[PDB]
Amino acid sequence: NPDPNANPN
Amino acid sequence: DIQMTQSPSTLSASVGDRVTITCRASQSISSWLAWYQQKPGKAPKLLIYKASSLESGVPSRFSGSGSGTEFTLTISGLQPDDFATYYCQQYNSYWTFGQGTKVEIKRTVAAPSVFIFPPSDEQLKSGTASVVCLLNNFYPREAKVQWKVDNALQSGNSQESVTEQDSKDSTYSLSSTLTLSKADYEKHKVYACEVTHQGLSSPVTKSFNRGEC
Amino acid sequence: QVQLVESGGNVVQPGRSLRLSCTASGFTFSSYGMHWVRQAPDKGLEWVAIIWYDGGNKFYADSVKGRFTISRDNSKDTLYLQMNSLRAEDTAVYYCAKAWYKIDDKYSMDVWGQGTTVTVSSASTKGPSVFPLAPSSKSTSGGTAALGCLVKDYFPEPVTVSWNSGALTSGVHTFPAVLQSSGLYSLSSVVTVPSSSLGTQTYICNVNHKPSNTKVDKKVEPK
């Protein structure tokens, strides 16, 4: 769903 | 995908110089570019993020610049700790790295010392023959090695290996190993390795005759 | 300080599976996403997968889709990479990297682990054959003589080579191993010694191959 380069933390 | 391409592949510089590594992107990545440093056997280390921001604990001699498709990593006043390989990485779409740029120690041109070793008698009993050509202590690294058996050029039966830069004299060494069966080795006489290098005014041929001590 | 320790790298045959691990310490593991990145001379640095802090969202490189499965157990501070139906091109050093927290729109990775080595091959474990590289008129120059040993047909990496149990270091060049079409590795180690001492000095090459428990000493004499 989210952008792969978005915040994963 | 987005492909990264660095330039040059290998850079020669001395302590105190200002070096420049260029990274180029296949499409516009805005400023989403990171720079990493890696030393042989060790993990990568983050140097620059978002094109120009310096990671904490990184010396001020590292500066980053660029935007869109072309980027540059500059190291002013090169220090001994900086001789390593530098990668660029885009993080605009997934994560893809460049091929890497190795910063090596620059020195005077040094022609290789070419030596050749016939196969031992112990190996021949195993039905195999390995002939070793040795290029010792040369600079720069680029060197061409060809094998000739009875003056016939060989193909697809040799392998090469090169050392890293020496810590004392900053030279390279290279070994070329020609592998033949015992049957093929005994039906030929002249085995030679022809070496082309910048430090040699002309190609050098080191040869031996089979059976001569 | 952030600490990432990889584990699980081993020799695996093509078509088989292998699970890597990455135990972390020095930070709150459950608070960060994690990446897997592999390195090999044929591929350079290649990103593999990323997983969110909670283990939900995962992404993969195209070439590993359908074969690799990334997961995490936050109650153990461990990251996993399940690799299935491995291929020859999966041979590399595999790093786990912590996602960074430079607050912006796009994110990447800051701290990497030390890596773990995966070798995909069907070769059987084999100790090396050591052959002398004798000095002669074709290995000598003004006052110098080159000699060495040929360490051929072993698997897997690595092999350690010394001369006279480490007392001889000057002029020694041990080359990186090359992989032969047989699937076995091979390397040579040479040393430059004075010509005047050729008759009296003893030069012994020491080869150690722990995977096969092989220890060989070979005296290198002129022919």
CA–CA separation, B142 and B122 (whole Å): 34
List residues bridging with B97 in a β-sheet: B89
CATH assignment at residue C147: 2.60.40.10
Q: b/e for B101-111, b at 16 or more Cβ within 10 A? A: bbbbbeeeebb
CB contact at 8 A, C98 and C186:
no
What's the one-letter identity of residue C75? S
Quick check: C79 contacting A, CB < 8 Å?
Answer: no
What's the one-letter identity of residue B128? T
Same domain, C82 and C56: yes
Same domain, C75 and C135: no
Residue with tokens 């360490």: C151
**Two tokens at B127?**
């039905």
Q: Other C-beta atoms within 10 Å of B155: how many?
A: 8
Domain that holds residue C173: 129-219
Q: Which residues contact C116 (CB under 8 A, 6 or more apart)?
A: C6, C7, C8, C9, C20, C93, C94
CB contact at 8 A, B129 and B123:
yes
Q: Which residues contact B125 (CB under 8 A, 6 or more apart)?
A: none
Determine whether the interchain pair A4/B91 forms a contact, defined as Cβ–Cβ distance below 8 Å: no
CB contact at 8 A, C18 and C38:
no
Same domain, C27 and C87: yes
DSSP 8-state assignment for residue C30: G
Q: How was this structure determined?
A: X-ray
Determine whether the interchain pair B115/C106 forms a contact, defined as Cβ–Cβ distance below 8 Å: no
Just give the CATH number of B4-105: 2.60.40.10
**Two tokens at B159?**
């392998």
CB contact at 8 A, B23 and B87:
no
**Two tokens at B113?**
């010392």
Which among C62, C64, C38, C59 has a CA at the least distance from the CA of C49?
C59
Which among C115, C28, C166, C8 has a CA at the least distance from the CA of B44?
C115
Residues of B in contact with C114 (CB under 8 A): 42-43
Same domain, C83 and C134: no
Intervals of CATH 2.60.40.10 along chain B: 4-105, 113-209
Chain center to CA of A7:
5
Same domain, C94 and C148: no
What does this entry list as its resolution, in Å? 2.4
Q: Which CATH class is domain B113-209?
A: mainly beta
Inter-chain contacts counted by CB atoms under 8 A, chains B and C: 122
Same domain, C14 and C105: yes
CB contact at 8 A, B55 and B73:
no
Same domain, C73 and C115: yes
Determine whether the interchain pair C31/A4 forms a contact, defined as Cβ–Cβ distance below 8 Å: no
Of C82, C102, C120, the last residue of a domain is C120
Which among C9, C10, C26, C21 has a CA at the least distance from the CA of C72?
C21
Same domain, C150 and C79: no
Total domains in the fold of chain C: 2
Q: Other C-beta atoms within 10 Å of B166: how many?
A: 15
Q: Other C-beta atoms within 10 Å of B174: how many?
A: 22
Of C100, C120, C140, the last residue of a domain is C120
CA–CA separation, B212 and B171 (whole Å): 32
DSSP 8-state assignment for residue C138: T
Same domain, C20 and C116: yes
Quick check: B32 contacting A, CB < 8 Å?
Answer: yes
